[PDB]
RNA sequence: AUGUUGUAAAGCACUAAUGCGCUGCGUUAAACUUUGAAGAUGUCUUUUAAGUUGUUGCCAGUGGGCAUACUGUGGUAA
RNA sequence: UGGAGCACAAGGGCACAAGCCUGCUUGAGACUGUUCCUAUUGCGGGACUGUUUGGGGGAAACCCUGGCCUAGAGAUCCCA
RNA sequence: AGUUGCGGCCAUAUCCACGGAAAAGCACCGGAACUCGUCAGAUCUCCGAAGUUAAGCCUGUGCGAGCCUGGGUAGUACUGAGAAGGGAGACCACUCGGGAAUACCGGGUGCUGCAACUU
């Protein structure tokens, strides 16, 4: 109710339940690049260089690296338009997306029988996908699994 | 208050990393070791570990990757039997040849050994400088873990080794024999512990006036024929042929694999249902 | 609500609608129910007569 | 078995000259003296007028022996006390101790400038491989086919010394 | 395809409450949470469906609102 | 396993520590730029870089531009 | 097939009781002239190799406490979208959708990476 900068917080900045401590080795030996999809996820643990709370649980990109830091852009809403926010994040409170995985597993595919189809010259780029569809056809059988005969079942109370 | 031995002393106790439960890793002092630039994206870096254990002095070259440590160079304190060397490990001549044996050893790996000639072994706090027209010699940094850090430690003396091979790792002349608390050093001190001026002094003091101590203190040195007065000599002549040809001695033995006699098979899960009924029926 | 078979998820195999009798004669029927009050559910048993097993519940319906 | 026999780990006396001052040099000159060794001094957590002390000054004084040393210095206080001990004093995981009345039945003679004080001896035994909880790389725990136990420990009185068990 | 959340309900693992029997039975929570929905909210792919905007100039009125379906807070209530 | 402490309100955080003891110190240095709360907008409070004929601690990796984090805040005109 | 050095994920790995262990290792272990540090060579630092697998480490066992994953509880509680339904109200019902949670029962009890060494 009063507009300090880490104003109520008290269930989001928190720790989740025999997952206390300081970050791992691990989360600072990733290799970051120009042109990455990133996940802002605070740890209440680490003081230093955290974002405003707006910002946990967005997905942005980096378009810088320094030291010790990233710099990321990515969309907020103000009452009628968008506008674009650039943010300074340290890297313990950063992880890599996993958000494209399925797109790139499939247009990586798609190149592949590419050049397998120029290597026979029998090509063709439409490989759309497509919904899912009405439905096929069925041949239920009853020569096993015999029918049960269900119905209403009069009602009956315990207490 | 929940007490030790209470179910609820349990269902909320969350355990340490594994390697704190063993009483192996400090955690703290291995994220500030291994902290790099994001930027950099030029190599990895390179410590130096060293660590003594009962028997015999450990160093090897490591990198950190996500999924665990790689080693690039490796040297021990019982490969030095091959150089003349069998009289007592885990010493200070014994860190000293160990480190400069893995100094030559790598820089063999990078044709560099043309360049980077060994520096003179008795000379003063030389931390080494790199030559024009060619490429920079290897920087290493020195992890020394749960080991305290005083004035003459063996692990130190590691150190000394590998800058006399020609590798460029940085210190300060601290931590010496020849320091002194104003800020100067006298480099003859450390050139008497190097070699054995303090094992032959020792030997001669205590075999003269009690031989019967002089027996048990010095028992494997004196039946394996060593005797106080050649000893820096040994060393001194150690420290030559490291220089001309320290790389490994190339076996590749075949599997171990009959030692699966030594296992202790479970039971499997019929073998504990009989188990239990039984003991239910007779009881 | 005996197994946990939804309609979004399950399949109509057949589908038949049992026709009317051709002669028409009087009888007695007997009609198991369940019905829903204003606070409940109930049980109830109701004979009558009829000419058909669908004409019947008409009739318990009508009263 | 060699790897099991019981032993003397640690000796601790110590003298309580209440309200620091002039009484405690006097005290300090004693363990100086019986023992051969500087004594540390200790002070009050908090202060009380009933006993008539307050939260930061001298009370006490004590020292720490080990080795053969301590061994010989349990054998004269024992014969004080004709070589007999209250069977209640060893406690669960084998220490005892007991207290000396009057300072001058030991050694040192008079000296009427010091005085008389009063001692207070605590023993602690144990077998070899003790270190696997004390040192700094893989500390752990010991394990119960060693830790010497309070029978364990009344056996061995009674082999040292030849004393006799009251109670 | 892949992230975020701690309400309803429920519960006693922490904080604060509540009767008995000498291990069980009984009762609670806006400023309790071991769990935890329906619903909301980020990003990738039209190389998914269905459908068919960008930049800038000069300017007005308005800044007492009210009702209702569902949903809260204060109040014996309106 | 923290059931204690950490100047002060409450919440969040912390065990070879952020708590306790102890050594040395004045980074509570001089300048310069990008960004968040935060907008149509001033002041204010935080975060992150660079440049130094620059410090302190440490064997070294490494950290430091006040206080473990969220409060302790003052235009135009005039004077020093 | 394993152990050791340095690790990643951080209980299927923790805690309590008993047992096993070929070769190496890892240890416990004998000392104090030098280095270094104490009330104390207990810890820390230096120099060793007589003894021992007793402990630590590693492996088995247990209708073991915990933890992990299933079933039941249950299409229950709660709930998104609707309609001039019932009721004095408190609230209950109907149509198309989504769907939990203790008590109880069953099964599991670390998985992996780089290097050196062992008949």
């Known amino acids: 109710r009063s507009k300090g900068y880490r104003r109520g917080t008290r269930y989001l900045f928190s720790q989740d339940h025999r997952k206390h401590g300081v970050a791992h080795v691990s989360k600072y030996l990733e290799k970051y690049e120009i042109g990455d999809m990133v996940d802002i996820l605070v740890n209440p643990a680490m003081m230093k260089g955290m974002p405003h709370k707006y910002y946990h649980g967005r997905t942005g990109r980096v378009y810088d690296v320094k030291p010790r830091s990233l710099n990321v852009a990515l969309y907020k809403r103000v009452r009628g338009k968008y506008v674009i926010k650039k943010i300074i994040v340290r890297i313990e409170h950063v992880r890599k997306s996993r958000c494209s995985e399925e797109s790139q597993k499939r247009i990586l595919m798609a190149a592949e029988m590419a050049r397998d189809a120029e290597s026979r010259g029998v090509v063709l780029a439409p490989s ?29 109370v315990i207490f | 208050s929940n007490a030790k031995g209470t179910r609820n002393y349990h269902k909320n106790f969350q355990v340490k990393r594994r390697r704190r439960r063993e009483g192996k890793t400090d955690y703290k002092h291995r994220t500030n070791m291994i902290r790099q630039d994001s930027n950099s994206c030029g190599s990895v870096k390179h410590r130096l570990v060293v660590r003594i254990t009962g028997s015999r002095v450990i160093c090897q070259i ?38 400069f044996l893995i100094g030559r050893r790598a820089l063999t790996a990078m044709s560099l050994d043309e360049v980077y000639r060994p520096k003179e072994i008795d000379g003063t706090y030389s931390v080494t400088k790199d030559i024009d027209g060619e490429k920079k010699a290897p920087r290493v940094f020195l992890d020394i873990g749960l080991a305290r850090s005083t004035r003459g430690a063996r692990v130190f003396g590691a150190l000394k080794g590998a800058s006399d091979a020609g590798l460029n790792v940085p210190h300060s002349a601290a931590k010496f ?5 104003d800020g100067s050093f006298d480099a003859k001190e450390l050139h008497d512990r190097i070699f ?29 024929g060593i005797d106080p007065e050649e000893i820096p000599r040994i060393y001194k002549s150690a420290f030559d042929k490291i220089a001309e040809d320290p790389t490994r001695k190339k076996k590749e033995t075949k599997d171990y694999s009959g030692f699966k006699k030594y296992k202790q098979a479970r039971l499997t899960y019929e073998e504990r249902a009989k188990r239990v009924q039984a003991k239910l029926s007779a009881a | 609500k005996k197994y946990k078979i939804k309609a979004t998820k399950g399949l109509i195999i057949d589908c038949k609608e049992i026709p009317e009798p ?4 009087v009888q007695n029927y007997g009609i198991r129910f369940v019905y829903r009050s204003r606070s409940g559910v109930h049980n109830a048993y109701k004979e009558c007569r009829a000419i058909s097993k669908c004409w019947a519940i008409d009739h318990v319906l009508r009263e | 078995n060699p790897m099991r026999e019981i032993s003397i780990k640690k000796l601790s006396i110590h003298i309580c000259a209440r309200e620091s001052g002039a009484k405690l040099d006097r005290a300090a000159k004693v363990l100086e003296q019986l023992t051969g060794q500087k004594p540390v001094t200790s002070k009050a957590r908090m202060t009380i007028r009933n006993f008539g002390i307050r939260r930061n000054e001298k009370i006490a004084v004590h020292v720490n022996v080990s080795g053969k040393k301590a061994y010989e210095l349990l054998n004269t206080a024992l014969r004080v006390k004709e070589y007999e001990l209250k069977e209640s004093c060893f406690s669960n995981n084998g220490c005892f101790g007991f207290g000396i009345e009057e300072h001058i039945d030991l050694g040192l003679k008079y000296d009427p400038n010091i005085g008389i004080f009063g001692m207070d001896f605590f023993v602690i035994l144990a077998r070899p491989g003790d270190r696997v909880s004390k040192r700094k790389r893989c500390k752990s725990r010991v394990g119960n086919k060693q830790r010497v136990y309070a029978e364990d420990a009344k056996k061995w009185f009674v082999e040292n010394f030849e004393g006799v068990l009251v109670e």
């Open chain 2, 177 to 181: 024999y020849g320091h002194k608390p």
């Open chain 2, 196 to 224: 054995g001026y303090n094992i032959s002094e020792y030997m001669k003091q205590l075999r003269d006036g009690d031989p019967e101590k002089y027996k048990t203190q010095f028992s494997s040195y004196i039946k394996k």
């Open chain 3, 22 to 25: 051709s002669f028409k004669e």
């Open chain 2, 62 to 99: 490591v990198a950190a990757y996500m999924d665990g440590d790689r080693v690039m160079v490796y040297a021990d304190s019982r490969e030095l039997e091959r150089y003349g060397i069998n009289f007592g490990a885990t010493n200070y001549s014994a860190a000293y040849a160990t480190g």
């Open chain 1, 128 to 156: 759309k996908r497509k919904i899912e569809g009405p439905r096929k056809a069925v041949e239920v059988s009853l020569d096993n699994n015999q029918p049960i005969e269900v119905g209403y079942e009069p009602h009956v």
